[PDB]
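A quick aside before the break. I want you to see a complete sequence-to-structure record at least once, exactly as it would be stored in a machine-readable document. Don't worry about memorizing anything.
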Amino acid sequence: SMNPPPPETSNPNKPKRQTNQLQYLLRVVLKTLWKHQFAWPFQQPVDAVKLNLPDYYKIIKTPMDMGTIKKRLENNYYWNAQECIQDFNTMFTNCYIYNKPGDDIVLMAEALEKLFLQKINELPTE
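That is the input. The structure line, written in tokens, reads:
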């Protein structure tokens, strides 16, 4: 029922790059999803205490959220685009795992994922 430490956003010994694909992931992908009317439940790690989800972290062992991804992109945490794309996919997958089909939160994730897929389709060449 307690919250775990949040995912890492800082790791000085992790090698880093700033690439045109990672720039696109921030300037286009993250910004598009962040501004959406359904963004709010995904803009920070799941607070299992505030949201009264005492089993959330029993079930979800690889937590991820756009607050974390936003910090990772702004602080150049990544080496490549695939790492960041995996974070988004983890976020959506977690939501579908924990929740019931048709739940509001699932519909919200689906709308963000649709946009995500549209933006990744046009990921610029390296």
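Two observations worth writing down. The domain at 19-123 is CATH 1.20.920.10 (Histone Acetyltransferase; Chain A). The chain has one domain: 19-123. We'll return to this after the break.
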